[PDB]
């Protein structure tokens, strides 16, 4: 099923077979990019930025309407968070569960879940070191987590 919890549900999304938008969404790639710079200036996730266009502004998958992907669009003129978002969110709760243990040093159900979240970090450190976007000197012990909220 999944990694650290045995659930074998199947909740996925599928792109249809159909290609770029037929009649509406009169919106160029230069016009998509100028909105999408405006969003990540306001400080949102690439997982949130895709949501913002998807509901509000009628936009489909950005791959069709631009020819490219929203992180490659993002890196073109330097708006990187420079610590990727898979590693960002899992740290963003790994700090909190350690903090929750600091006032409950008997909540061992939360202690076991820390092991699963510490498992997921050091696996994902191994992948990002392999694509060399995360350098080989990089580490993660305790306080690296703290200031990097």
């Amino acid at each position: 099923g999944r990694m650290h919890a045995p659930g074998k549900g199947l909740s996925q999304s599928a792109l249809p077979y159909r290609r770029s938008v037929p009649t509406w969404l009169k919106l160029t790639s230069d016009d998509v990019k100028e909105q999408i710079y405006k969003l990540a200036k306001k400080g949102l996730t690439p997982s949130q930025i895709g949501v913002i266009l998807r509901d509000s502004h009628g936009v489909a998958q950005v791959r069709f309407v631009t020819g490219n992907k929203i992180l490659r669009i993002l890196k073109s003129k330097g708006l990187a968070p420079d610590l990727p978002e898979d590693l960002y969110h899992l740290i963003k709760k790994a700090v909190a569960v350690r903090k929750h243990l600091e006032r409950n040093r008997k909540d061992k159900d939360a202690k076991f879940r820390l092991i699963l979240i510490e498992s997921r970090i050091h696996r994902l450190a191994r992948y990002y070191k392999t694509k060399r976007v995360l350098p080989p000197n990089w580490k993660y012990e305790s306080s690296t987590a703290s200031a990097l909220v």
Binding site: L10, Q12, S13, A14, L15, P16, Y17, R18, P22, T23, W24, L25, V51, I52, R54, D55, S56, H57, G58
Partner: protein
């Protein structure tokens, strides 16, 4: 015996999203035509943000598990 290549379009709506042969998803874009000032709003049906239009500046969709529902006197169609 059984058919795979030519099933019935009755059968395949019933089957799950990614379990049919073409796998095209079950959401749609809906044309919320609020009477606010002028604007026709294209908005995803299975939405997640409070879709606030820019002219009238009120709520057009509720975030709900499943699909959004509309607020008061908002009419829609599909763009196809």
């Amino acid at each position: 015996a059984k058919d795979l290549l030519h099933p019935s379009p009755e059968e395949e709506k019933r089957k799950h999203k990614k379990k049919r042969l073409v796998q095209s998803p079950n959401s749609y874009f809906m044309d919320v035509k609020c009477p606010g000032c002028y604007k026709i709003t294209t908005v995803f049906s299975h939405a997640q943000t409070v879709v606030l239009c820019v002219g009238c500046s009120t709520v057009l969709c509720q975030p709900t598990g499943g699909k959004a529902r509309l607020t008061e006197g908002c009419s829609f169609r599909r763009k196809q």
